[PDB]
Design a protein that fits this description.
Elements (H helix, E strand, L loop, with lengths): L7 E5 L7 H9 L12 E3 L7 E5 L3 H10 L11 E4 L7 H4 L1
Antiparallel strand pairs: 1-3, 1-4, 2-3
The protein binds potassium ion and magnesium ion (5 copies).
The protein binds a RNA duplex (197 and 22 nucleotides) through strand 2 and strand 3.
Length: 95
RNA sequence: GGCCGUGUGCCUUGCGCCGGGAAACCACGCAAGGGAUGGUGUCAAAUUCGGCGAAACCUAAGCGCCCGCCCGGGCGUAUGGCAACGCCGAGCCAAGCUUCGCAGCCAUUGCACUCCGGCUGCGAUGAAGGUGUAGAGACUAGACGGCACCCACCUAAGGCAAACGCUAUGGUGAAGGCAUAGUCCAGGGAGUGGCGA
RNA sequence: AAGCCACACAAACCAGACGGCC
């Protein structure tokens, strides 16, 4: 239901039919009206397809995002989020 | 369409070998003989533009030699010619494989930051091979062609095996297609004339 | 020379390696 804090969040269950390039923008701002963003890495692999990694800058932006958007049916399809289990190779990269 | 020969290709055998492969086998120089050269299925597209190369075989302008002297001849000779055929650059190509994109759909609920699921179709693509390369050229097929598989035989790195050894993804099963089987038309057969020596 | 190129054309045959004999 919930997850441990993280400057980025994990979201699943989507209509991959979309364009990686496309979906990335259909989030770029879709998930940024309360905080900044770093990168919405997404893949189409038989593994990563159907999932994305919203990256913020501030924990809060995420703490909130994790709620101000959870369970929301994206493209006539629900949604599932969870703070990331491993702070992205961008944050844990620098700090 | 039979027999002799000439050249180029080709395989077999012998011999030589900086050589590639682990091995078989390929390659390369070369000499001599024509015994031997697997099967089914699939593809039929592109078939364009340029350039180098070239045996035998033809002809003898010039040159050399000779008929003692020019005239005229005779002898030798190819880079003049045909041509089996060896290839390059650029362009394009069926289906099979590379890899990228979209569509059925089949499956996926999957925690990542270096990409990448699977048949089917369309497009692009890359490495082969082909095309350019016939008697001018035109159209059909398919084989000796491309591709998949099967078989026979060879060696066995690797994987397997305690081990004698086992096994291909590897290798042998010619070349022909610079028109092969065909149907066309050319060309000669058999005219005229221009270049030419 | 050989050959080569134009327009013209009767056949069978020859004809897409060459030179010969039949
Ligand atoms: K072995
Ligand atoms: Mg050809
Ligand atoms: Mg052999
Ligand atoms: Mg021929
Ligand atoms: Mg023919
Ligand atoms: Mg020929």
């Amino acid at each position: 239901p919930e997850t441990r804090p993280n400057h980025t969040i994990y979201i699943n269950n989507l209509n991959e039919k979309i364009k990686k390039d496309e979906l990335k923008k259909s989030l770029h701002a879709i998930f940024s009206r309360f905080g900044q963003i770093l990168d919405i890495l997404v893949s189409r692999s038989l593994k990563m397809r159907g999932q994305a990694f919203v990256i913020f800058k501030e924990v809060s932006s995420a703490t909130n995002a994790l709620r101000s958007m959870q369970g929301f049916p994206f493209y006539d399809k629900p949604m599932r989020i969870q703070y990331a289990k491993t702070d992205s190779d961008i944050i844990a990269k620098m700090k």
